[PDB]
A paper describes a structure:
The psychrophilic aromatic aminotransferase from Psychrobacter sp. B6 is a representative of pyridoxal phosphate (PLP)-dependent enzymes. PsyArAT exhibits an activity typical for ArAT: transamination, which is a transfer of an amine group between aromatic α-amino acids and α-ketoacids. The mechanism of active site adjustment toward substrates of psychrophilic aromatic amino acid aminotransferase (PsyArAT) from Psychrobacter sp. B6 is discussed based on crystal structures of complexes with four hydroxy-analogs of substrates: phenylalanine, tyrosine, tryptophan and aspartic acid. These competitive inhibitors are bound in the active center of PsyArAT but do not undergo transamination reaction, which makes them an outstanding tool for examination of the enzyme catalytic center.
The hydrogen bonds network made by a FOH ligand were slightly different for both monomers of the PsyArAT/FOH complex. In either case, carboxyl group of FOH creates two parallel hydrogen bonds with the guanidine group of Arg374 (3.2 Å and 3.0 Å in monomer A, 2.3 Å and 2.8 Å in monomer B), one with a side-chain nitrogen of Asn183 (3.2 Å for both monomers) and one with an indole ring nitrogen of Trp130 (3.4 Å for both pockets). Interactions between the ligand carboxyl group and the cofactor was present only in pocket B, where it had contact with formyl oxygen (3.1 Å). The interaction with the peptide bond nitrogen of Gly34 was made by the carboxyl oxygen of FOH (2.8 Å) in the active site of pocket B, while the ligand in the neighboring subunit made contact with the same residue, using its hydroxyl group (3.4 Å). Generally, most of the differences were a result of different placement of the -OH group in the pockets due to a rotation of ligand by 90°. Thus, in monomer A, besides the aforementioned interaction with Gly34, the hydroxyl group of FOH made bonds with the carbonyl oxygen of Gly34 (3.4 Å), the hydroxyl oxygen of Tyr214 (3.3 Å) and PLI Schiff base nitrogen (3.5 Å). In pocket B, the -OH of the ligand made the second contact with Trp130 (3.3 Å) and created two hydrogen bonds with a PLP molecule, first with the aldehyde group (2.3 Å) and the second with the hydroxyl oxygen of the cofactor (3.1 Å). In the catalytic center of both complexes, the Arg280* switch was in the “down” position; however, in the case of PsyArAT/YOH, it was placed a little deeper than in the PsyArAT/FOH complex. As stated, in PsyArAT/FOH complex, Arg280* was placed slightly further from the ligand; in the active site of monomer A, it interacted with Asp11 (2.8 Å) like in the previous case, but it also reached Tyr8 hydroxyl oxygen (3.2 Å). In the active pocket of monomer B, Arg280* made an even shorter bond with the OH group of Tyr8 (2.8 Å), but the interaction with Asn132 (2.9 Å) replaced the one with Asp11.
Numbering used by the authors:
A (entry chain B), B (entry chain A): 1 to 398
Write the structure that this text describes.
Amino acid sequence: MFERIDYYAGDPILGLVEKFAADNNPDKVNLGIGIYYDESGVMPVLDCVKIAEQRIADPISPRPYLPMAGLPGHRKGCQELLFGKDAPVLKDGLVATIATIGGSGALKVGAEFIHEWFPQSKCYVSDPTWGNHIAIFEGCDIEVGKYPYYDTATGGIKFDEMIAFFETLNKDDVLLLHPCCHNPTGVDLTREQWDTVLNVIQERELIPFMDIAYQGFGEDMDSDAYAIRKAVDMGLPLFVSNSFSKNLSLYGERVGGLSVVCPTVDETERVFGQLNSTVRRIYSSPPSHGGRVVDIVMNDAALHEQWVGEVYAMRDRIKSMRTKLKSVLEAKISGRNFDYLTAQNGMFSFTGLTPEQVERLQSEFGIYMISNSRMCVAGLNSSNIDYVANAMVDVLKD
Amino acid sequence: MFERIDYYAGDPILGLVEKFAADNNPDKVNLGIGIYYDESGVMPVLDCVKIAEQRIADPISPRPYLPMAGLPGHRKGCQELLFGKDAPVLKDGLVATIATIGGSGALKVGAEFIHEWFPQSKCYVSDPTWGNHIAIFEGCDIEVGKYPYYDTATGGIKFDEMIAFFETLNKDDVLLLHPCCHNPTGVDLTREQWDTVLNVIQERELIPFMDIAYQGFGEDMDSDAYAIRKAVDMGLPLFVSNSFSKNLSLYGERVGGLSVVCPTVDETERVFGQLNSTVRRIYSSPPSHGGRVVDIVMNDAALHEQWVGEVYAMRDRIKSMRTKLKSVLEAKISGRNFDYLTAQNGMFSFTGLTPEQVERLQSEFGIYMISNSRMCVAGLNSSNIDYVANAMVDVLKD
Ligand SMILES: Cc1ncc(COP(=O)(O)O)c(C=O)c1O
Ligand SMILES: *Cc1c(COP(=O)(O)O)cnc(C)c1O
Ligand SMILES: O=C(O)[C@@H](O)Cc1ccccc1
Ligand SMILES: O=C(O)[C@@H](O)Cc1ccccc1
Ligand SMILES: [Mg+2]
């Protein structure tokens, strides 16, 4: 009966974590997953969240269906965070926003909308990009190519080729952009660079789709959303898929939003409708618990202030781990320059190791990174940072 | 830019519920949505759930991603409920199970898997069925038809006619079947009738997709799964989408499951694999809270036992309401037989009122039913029972 059914290779990341989890090396460290850990190496329960969740259990309440859009609190929360507290675009009401099943869910609802209403639109992702970016869009029958982003030699963006690619693209083609914290490279666009990408986007009449999963981990909430707030002011139409998984440390509850920026208030009334429609045929409505935590935190002034604070802290620890790594490498290896490590943003570092080098850190050390060299800086703490840095030196000297 | 986008109308049930909210009428009653309400007309928090949630709140824990297939306890939870604890089929390891974003999430993943691997398969739903059933399958670009089911003149099933229709479908065509508690009519197949349906399905080699959203509201957990369990013995390739929304009274948390019964261990691995692949490409992972509630309630024997009793309570309450409705209507109306009301099962009832008659109930009484006559019996309690039946009498008398 199910002879035709093909085996799954697994999520390429989770294929690695599986190898790690069923490997019993004493010294093993996992730096191959986009999860934030603290100094003890454990996943933090944020204080603001802990408060949100105690409000929820006091008392345990009946659990009706959330609106398909999710709770308005969630919906406002996303908007004020992405665009600005009482921002002009929001004042206008030119942004359609739903709660989604994390960032993933937001991209899916977004992607489906695009497949249906713009069948002729192709989608383009960075070279390289996150794995699920391609899978989600292709899963909608969207044809997916890649724009050149990362330059192997410099270790920065291949900007000249990139803008040139964008010229060769048709009206309504979809550009899957990372406003900050590039996954997996860590190499972000400069604020001047964004203005160049966007002005081409306005001219070439293209569609910008922005995937911001790590707001508050680049520079800060407001700075990280620069690409978002600019495109808006340029009057451009734009899709914004946001995630609270990392910055809220709530991966499990599947919290996130999709926001769509429209020329008109009426056009927004239409888009919002089709978003609910798209949700209806997928999962019907977002989960209550997750929705409530977002609502509580984003809308409680004190809790919100407290939240921005703890994200600042997480960001800072990462920035700090980037420094210590650069320190130990520059000290023990006189030859190469490792400024890219502290130049890169958010949770990821393309450590610029060859696929053979990444292999070596795995066999002898129990140090896991992706074949393309991506490393989650958040996997590093005082207690293990020493070991990893030396191992990288040893693999670099080889 | 989005001028190609047409307005959504809204979910028709939600349009009816919305209409109910804005009603002036002091005595308005909502019988239009398939939510269980207790003898007071409030959504209940199950005691077993209260206990689970407080276990989750003590202490509040880190929130890592659930496996794509959800927690193993949630899966074991589902499998045991549907197929029966220590089912041969479960012992053989021949069911691929994932946690899903409610029943809707199970239907979606299910449909998407079918669209992928059986592109020529068409899907047939019962006439009539739950509105949202079509949306999901059409939402996958699967062509959807209607197999004859409910007979209007008799108020039963056009069974003879149905079986012949099934003889006319192609290999691997998909039948969406309500094992019990048919939404929206409440008219169910007898155990005999089910053997014939499954025999044809076997012979024509059709795919039976069972959507069970009300397990324990028909007769009981075992009886309601009879179609599921018979299907299994016959060696049929079964798809079961189970919702916990209603029986676990946890709609908001989006708890359900999807299970695929396979000939071999290897086919189960391939299918399990692809089920993950599908989940990854949609939303990545199911929500942590709802999953944990399910895991806790199902796999704690004292809680499982308590849960089951609390469902049967709800079942028994619905049942008394049917009895009382029949009683009152038979008292004040002659030339009609009201045994169909007690002949039906679960939360829904095709009450046999004309579209105009439903219209009069809303207009003067604020009694809200679907135009096709579906009534959620679970919106009836001793406080409104007399009011509703009398209103039904008035509308029927003329
Ligand atoms: C680059 C990127 N974008 C978006 C997401 C959204 O995923 P989630 O469902 O956890 O929000 C992720 C998650 O890892 C990601 O890595
Ligand atoms: C409610 C329901 C489902 C599942 O809907 P969810 O809210 O996602 O759990 C499936 N089938 C029927 C007939 C239903 O009434
Ligand atoms: O970029 C990363 O490394 C994470 O997105 C990986 C991941 C996402 C979702 C689920 C499991 C794993
Ligand atoms: O059949 C019904 O109407 C409800 O049981 C389920 C539902 C109602 C409204 C919206 C979504 C889902
Ligand atoms: Mg499709």
